[PDB]
Amino acid sequence: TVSLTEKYKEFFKIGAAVTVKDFEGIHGRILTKHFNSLTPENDMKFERIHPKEDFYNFEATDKIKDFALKHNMQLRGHTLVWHNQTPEWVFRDNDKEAPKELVIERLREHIKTICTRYRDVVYSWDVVNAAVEDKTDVLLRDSKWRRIIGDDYIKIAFEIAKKYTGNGKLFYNDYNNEMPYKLEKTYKVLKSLLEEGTPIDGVGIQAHWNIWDKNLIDNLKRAIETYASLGLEIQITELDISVFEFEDRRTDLLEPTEEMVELQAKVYEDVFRVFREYRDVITSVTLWGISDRHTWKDNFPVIGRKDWPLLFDIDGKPKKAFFRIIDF
Template sequence: MRRSTRSLLVATAAAALVLPLCGVTAANADTPSFSNADKSALRNQAPVDLAIGTAAWGEQMLTDYDPAAPTEFQDVLSRQFSSVTPENDMKWDAVHPAPDVYDFASADAVVAFAKANHQKVRGHTLLWHSQNPAWVTEASGTWTCDQAKDVLEDHIRTVVGHFKGEIYEWDVANEIFKDTWDAGGVSLRTDRNPFLKACADDPVGLLADAFTWAHEADPDAVLFLNDYNAEGINEKTDAYYDLAQQLLDRGAPLGGFGAQAHLSLLYGFDASLQANLERFAALGLKVAITEADVRIPLLDGETEPTAEQVATQTERYQALLQACLNVTACSSFTVWGFSDAHSWVPDVFPGEGWATISDEDYTPKPAFDALLTSLKDATPGVSPRRG
């Protein structure tokens, strides 16, 4: 685990937050898990039609979880969030490690934890080009489209069916478009996604089938497309908008579009986010911010950001949430982990970090306070979210 000494900046910011990220109050002293009396909780300040979520790993739930004596991680998770996304536990390599083997132990732990703490669960993910087990990546080059469909249909029906009634939103198709900087530009990943590759003659047909199988397995779950670099109106989201129309025209039960919102201070903020969410909502879809974090480039040898960087990070978190609040079809806002102790960022983006809303010791950052304030302000006079 990466540890650092908190700077004067962080200590000062944390002291200024009179609403702590966790801690026992008189109202919840006898309740070890969620209490709706806790006004310092993001989940309690959110409009009733907006789930406030975070990602977590199943092993964090499995480690000696005792509702009467939760770990600090479990305590914060239960108090602050109304939705949980299994960060890895529902991906192919976790739940379907061999052709005839399904392993739901870790994913079941997430669902059990959520149930115990009055939380919803977002399913993630059913069709992706990454984190597939070896038996998929090795066999996919020889599959016909029909063979690929048989494998995918069995997986979707089995996984979605296992969690029927437990998942309110499913990321069915994840990161299925290439980027402008990839070879060939923005197009469906028929080169890397094993199922789209096998069905390259009609990849939209495969996607329509995937949504249909998921819907038949759990008619109540809202089914999403999900991707990064999908916040504003750009070439990639134009492609998603066109795909959404094609899927809807084919009668596919597409229900939502998710923008991951993995942001970095190395790049600007796309102010067309709200307009992008609105155009997908106009198709009759739910929209969501599904994996938000805002990473900060750190100087060599430094572990903490400058005051200016902290201010910019706070503004971007707030802008993400405000765009969601302003679009009534935005059904969930999820941060990708809430503590730097468990963030994926330093391992994947060398030289960047400090990306979540609390530090490694669960001390809230100014971004947390900004999110809490924005949720409190989502009243009928400011936002149509509450009535």
């Protein structure tokens, strides 16, 4: 039995990425059993919730909020400002590109609207997502947000959100931010935000991981400690552990191999022991899905294959990895 949220009740919240259909059937039972935190996988993203300037779509996010309230769960607000899944209208002023202040004013109104509607159920917001340049050694990714608003756009987004979020915690969220090159760069960016009076409460470590990273444990321990030194909360926001190396695009596997299944268990053990070790600084751990039945990893980075990245298998049964992380 041993629901995960209960077992971890004194350590951190235990979360899952969700859509409306996940409240039904076997997924719905896993959630209410094991999880006390929910993140809308897509429905709170700008393109989905606010597809045209004069049109918001609240149906899905309202349903997610309601389900959470009815089951004593809370939400992570994902995400306000991101270079992906953001509609082009935001950056257009008719036939011209939109200037800095117009984009800021649209952002103001978007954040006001979304944060006002969900502030009562959201405990943490991903205010800015994946703003740190992941490839080159320039600090900031060069998105339309970053280009048009300018160098201060992260502070600007955080100051706006702080108006409407109450006691919700404000997070900067990103991937690969446990890796040495990106850790150093992210640390720099966050340290400077804080010295500028940015109301940032913590860092999201997305944790889109895989079984073959022999550097992960050392990388994770470092990162957690490095971010903690800035006085930031830590949340593991989108945990999954792929059986493939990122650039292994093989499409042949119908199932995980024995070495893969067992290596995954060890890595889940290793990461969750690290999560448990840093219980004082980690406030939430969310997995990017419930079971291997629905995972974005089936279409990223390769359209139309299968991955087995989560704690519950395609049938909905707890994997040996599950029982490892609850043996404590």
